Amino acid sequence: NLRVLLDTAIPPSFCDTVSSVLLDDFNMVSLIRTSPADSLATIKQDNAEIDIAITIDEELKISRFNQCVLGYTKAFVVAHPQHPLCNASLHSIASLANYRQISLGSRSGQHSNLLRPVSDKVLFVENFDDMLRLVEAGVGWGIAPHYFVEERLRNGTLAVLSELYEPGGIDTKVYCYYNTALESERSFLRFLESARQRLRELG
């Protein structure tokens, strides 16, 4: 039995590749969705017995676990098109720390440097659906994955703020935290190259 954790931030394409590739070697394979804010929090509970975690969140070294880079995914800072910062000027990028941010909440109450909110006006949510509902209502701005907002951006229901910060959207390493045990086992090495080599063909 293999237990795999996936961030809600991890595109559903990546999830399709991971899941497929594992069934070639593994007989029981349990997939588990988690807020990016609860990913590492979860694997560090020993009882939760997670073997692999695919998450965007970064923490240097963890008990029992090793890190590596599966690939890259995009993220945009999004607001209601009528949002004051809609012009997305270079002063507006500094003024994001002034305006209400709709940030992801941590069950642990604690955030990493990456996922910690930037502004003092913060309204926490559990998932990106809740985030974008509030952002569509112009209640604030938020940082969400590409696949979650591709739909709404073309439909014009949402606008981007991030282009002057990082043109093309904010590149984000998808990390693979694997139980130290698996490093020797070639079952995992197959999965890693295979998943990487497929995720590379998406890119």
Would you tell me which residues interact with ligand QAE (CB under 6 A)?
9, 56, 73, 75, 77, 93, 96, 114-115, 118, 143-145, 162, 165, 170, 172
**CA-closest candidate to residue 99, choices 135, 133, 45:** 135
Q: Which residue has the tokens 């295979």?
A: 194
116 binds, among a second copy, ligand QAE, none (CB under 5 to 8 A by kind): a second copy
Residue from 12, 16, 24, 97 that binds a second copy (CB under 8 A)? 97
Q: What's the Cα-to-Cα distance from 171 to each of 22, 141, 180, rounded to whole Å?
A: 26, 19, 27
* Binds 180: which of ligand QAE, a second copy, none (CB < 5-8 Å by kind): a second copy
Under 8 Å CB-to-CB from 1, ≥6 apart: which residues? 28, 30
By CB under 8 A, residue 189 contacts a second copy: yes
The one segment of 23-31, 47-55, 62-70, 143-151 that binds a second copy by CB under 8 A: 62-70
Long-range contacts of 127-132 (CB under 8 A, 24+ apart): 127/8, 127/35, 128/8, 128/9, 128/104, 130/102, 131/102, 131/104, 132/78, 132/158
User: Which residue, chain included where needed, has tokens 């090793």?
Assistant: 66
Please, are residues 91 and 184 in contact by the beta-carbon 8 Å criterion? Answer: no
60 binds, among a second copy, ligand QAE, none (CB under 5 to 8 A by kind): a second copy
Beta carbon nearer to ligand QAE, 21 or 144: 144
60 binds a second copy (CB under 8 A): yes
- Applying CB under 8 A, which residues contact a second copy? 58, 60-61, 66-69, 72, 90-91, 93-94, 97, 113, 116, 118, 164-167, 170-171, 173, 180, 183-184, 188-189, 192, 196
